[PDB]
């Protein structure tokens, strides 16, 4: 699809730090890759109703590193978490996105920064980005991930609220 | 084992910004991958470390964390350090880019104004531009490819390649 506006409305509404849609590979069944995202976090360096520009710029920088443009020194540590997630690919069963696809239900990580590296492969990247809460759930034939620098106890109403905001955007 | 001390002596001696040894994949004939490097460029942060290996070891540690005691965070790096770090991800087919070109041709490729090089010759010309790297040189060496680059404009000088190989083997 193109999911950019849906991701933006839903992340900005719940006021979390970022969202990613992990989509199933066209070529490799049961392999998740980066589909699209929205970055809603802090920046240190500077009609777009939904503030898509910084997300489009982080994407452009990722594409140039992986072979008003941003340079690497412009990013916060939270922006680097967002950008390096674009490189990640998950086998069904693998990590929190692969886990959520296989299990067919949410994985809600509180204290994500301390999660076992075999449950959450990104726990140390989360720690450097001050990301505390990370949530993955099956949605639209892929996996929707949201994370925040805030500590939020497991609340299935947040997931319901994102799916609804997403589908009505 | 490793080339870290050899790379350090030779890059620090010629006073260039960095060196990389691209080594042929054990698994894939004619594919180059990152073997080892030495970063000799600017920084913005701050047992005897004679050759200043620590920052190179820290840039490697940060790369391994990004690809899944004084560890670096991404915000700590200069734009030249980012060139050095993202090179660790790159893989080249024989014939492909300047390292693959150097392996295939069996001789040096000396890029001046590397920031303006055609992207089919030098895949990294825009990364070079963001890192203020002007001169990039690859040549076959030890069954792989040695790459050196600098923020300076240095016209083609095969005596630089001779001095690096000699410094490298006498290190
Ligand atoms: Cl020094
Ligand atoms: Cl290249
Ligand atoms: Cl030059
Ligand atoms: Na994970």
UniProtKB/Swiss-Prot annotation, chain B:
Coiled coil stretches, renumbered: none
Tissues in which the protein is found: Ubiquitous with higher levels in buds and flowers. Specifically localized in developing root hair cells. Expressed in epidermal root hair cells (trichoblasts) and moves to root hairless cells (atrichoblasts) by a cell-to-cell movement through plasmodesmata (at protein level).
Location(s) in or outside the cell: Nucleus
Induction of the gene: By UV treatment. Negatively regulated by MYB66/WER, GL3 and BHLH2 in the developing non-hair cells, and positively regulated by CPC and TRY in the developing hair cells.
Assembly notes: Efficient DNA binding requires dimerization with another bHLH protein. Homodimer and heterodimer with GL3. Interacts with CPC, MYB0/GL1, MYB5, MYB23, MYB113, MYB114, MYB75/PAP1, MYB90/PAP2, TT2, TRY, TTG1 and MYB66/WER.
Function: Transcription activator, when associated with MYB75/PAP1, MYB90/PAP2 or TT2. Involved in epidermal cell fate specification. Negatively regulates stomata formation but promotes trichome formation. Together with MYB66/WER, promotes the formation of non-hair cells in root epidermis cells in the N position. Whereas together with CPC, promotes the formation of hair cells in root epidermis cells in the H position by inhibiting non-hair cell formation. Also seems to play a role in the activation of anthocyanin biosynthesis, probably together with MYB75/PAP1. Involved in seed mucilage production.
Record's protein name: Transcription factor EGL1
Organism: Arabidopsis thaliana
């Amino acid at each position: 699809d193109n999911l950019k506006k849906q991701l933006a409305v839903s992340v900005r509404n719940i006021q979390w730090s970022y969202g990613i849609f992990w989509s199933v590979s066209a070529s490799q069944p049961g392999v998740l890759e980066w589909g699209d995202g929205y970055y809603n976090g802090d920046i240190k360096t500077r009609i777009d109703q939904l503030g898509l520009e910084r997300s489009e710029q982080l994407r452009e920088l990722y594409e140039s590193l992986s072979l008003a443009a941003l340079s690497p020194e412009d990013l916060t540590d939270t922006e680097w978490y967002y950008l390096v997630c674009m490189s990640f690919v998950f086998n069904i069963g693998e990590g929190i996105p692969g886990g959520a696809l296989s299990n067919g239900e949410p994985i809600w990580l509180c204290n994500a920064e301390t999660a076992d590296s075999k449950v959450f492969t990104r726990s140390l990247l989360a720690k450097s980005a001050s990301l505390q809460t990370v949530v993955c759930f099956p949605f639209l034939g892929g996996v929707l991930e949201i994370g925040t620098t805030e500590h939020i106890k497991e609340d299935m109403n947040v997931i319901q609220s994102v799916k609804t905001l997403f589908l009505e955007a």
